Design a binder for this molecule. Structure first.
Ligand SMILES: O=C(O)c1c[n+]2c([nH]1)[C@H](O)[C@@H](O)[C@H](O)[C@H]2CO
Length: 435
């Protein structure tokens, strides 16, 4: 048996735009994912977040599902434009009411809330003012954060500033695959820098406002391996937590990041580094996949390997999660770590028996939970693990076509069907580990 520490946090994870629907209900401002997904060509099948899982009306049912599964922590995000429709200034009481009911319900049912302040749904009003490209976002984010702390900090004690700022900056502003859909390398690296400055301003306000809670930040990570026998060192420093943690902990960008991108960063960016080092309480790592990497005249390309893949076409590489856990301890030694996301998309079918027999997702989860256990044995301070996702949801530019839930969602009726994964996971949580 692989048993976890006493009081280890077993959780599930969602994001506001991915599950809620009703993006303009009760005075909410538009977000950039609303305008981006309503632009033809940007999202698979013309899918948008207009309805999604209808969690905006079905929130109680979904929480009752979390409770019924015995899952102990729920990671969810707040939609900035529900709270402040123009991004700054006016506060919308109905948006606060929405998350207040979610928060109180979780606490009643003994589920611990983990709130992601920013999970990609920037108010459109602020995008008009440049969004992450604008230095003033540090102030706009700080004021948004202050609102959340004041309203919810009496009850929510675990906070995440940003979800995957690498994706926000690079996929949003260089690849243009995500909102706001831009393809400018200089904008993209100014967004990296501003995401850091905004994160740090939010931490600073947190210390002044919620004197008994904890705050951290979440990164996407890949397990990169070299094709022959440096481009791997780069991918780690650039795609993984070092891009942000080197500034946070060491006061500058990683070495290979500066080699590639010094010219794209603002000229006096080092002026902001002392503020950027605002102390954080934990590091959240997301992990999904491994990649084989070769040098190639960003001077990097991926080499496809055989290996089982998910419906995303992501190579299943469970040892990556142990690696990334060991490497973060080794490189930055954060006091606490969480796996804030881990999961897989598979082509899920409801059998005639009414169940979803996702043995592939179970194999995926079990393999990665084992590897996280190992890192705990070898001393990594991992305090929690979060499955992405509770529900099948809007998977960004893939639309509804990728299913990550441990609960199946039938979109034509909004019926939730717990998958074999969910039941299996429920048992892991109950036992506090693998049997
Ligand atoms: O780092 C990643 O690969 C990654 C995967 N995911 C994410 N980041 C985001 O945090 C979620 O909003 C996604 O829906 C989820 C599944 O694609």
């Amino acid at each position: 048996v692989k048993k976890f520490p006493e009081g280890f946090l077993w959780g599930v994870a969602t994001a506001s735009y991915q599950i809620e629907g009703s993006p303009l209900a009760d005075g909410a401002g538009m977000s950039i994912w609303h305008t981006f997904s309503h632009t033809p060509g940007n999202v698979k099948n013309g899918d948008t977040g207009d309805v999604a899982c209808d969690h905006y009306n079905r929130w109680k049912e979904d929480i009752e599902i979390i409770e019924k599964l015995g899952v102990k922590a729920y990671r969810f995000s707040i939609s900035w434009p529900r709270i402040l429709p123009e991004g700054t200034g006016r506060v919308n009481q109905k948006g606060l009411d929405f998350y207040n009911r979610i928060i109180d319900t979780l606490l009643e049912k003994g589920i611990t809330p983990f709130v992601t302040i920013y999970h990609w749904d920037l108010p459109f009003a602020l995008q008009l003012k440049g969004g992450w490209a604008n230095r003033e976002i540090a102030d706009w984010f700080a004021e948004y954060s202050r609102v959340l702390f004041e309203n919810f900090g009496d009850r929510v004690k675990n906070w995440i500033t940003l979800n995957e700022p690498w994706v926000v900056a690079i996929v949003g502003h260089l690849y243009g695959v995500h909102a706001p859909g831009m393809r400018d390398i200089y904008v993209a690296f100014r967004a990296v820098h501003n995401l850091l400055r905004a994160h740090a301003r939010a931490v600073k306000v947190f210390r002044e406002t919620v004197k008994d809670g904890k705050i951290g930040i979440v990164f996407n990570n890949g397990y990169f391996e070299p094709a022959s026998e440096r481009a791997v060192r780069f991918m780690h420093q650039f795609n993984n937590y070092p891009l942000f943690l080197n500034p946070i902990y060491r006061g500058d960008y990683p070495e290979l990041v500066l080699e590639f991108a010094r010219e794209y960063l603002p000229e006096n960016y080092k002026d902001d580094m002392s503020e950027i080092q605002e102390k954080i309480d934990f590091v959240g790592l997301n992990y999904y996949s491994g990649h084989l990497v070769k040098f190639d005249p960003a001077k990097v390309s991926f080499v496809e390997r055989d290996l089982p893949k998910t419906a995303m076409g992501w190579e299943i590489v469970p040892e990556g999660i142990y690696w990334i856990l060991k490497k973060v301890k080794e490189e930055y030694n954060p006091p606490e770590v969480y796996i804030t996301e881990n999961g897989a998309a598979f082509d899920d079918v409801v059998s005639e028996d009414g169940r979803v027999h996702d043995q592939n997702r179970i194999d995926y989860l079990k393999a990665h939970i084992g590897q996280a256990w190992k890192a705990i044995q070898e001393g990594v301070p991992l305090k929690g693990y979060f499955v992405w996702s509770l529900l099948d949801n809007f998977e960004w530019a893939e639309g509804y076509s990728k299913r990550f839930g441990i609960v199946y969602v039938d979109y034509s009726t909004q019926k939730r069907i717990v998958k074999d994964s969910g039941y299996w996971y429920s048992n892991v949580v109950k036992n506090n580990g693998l049997e």
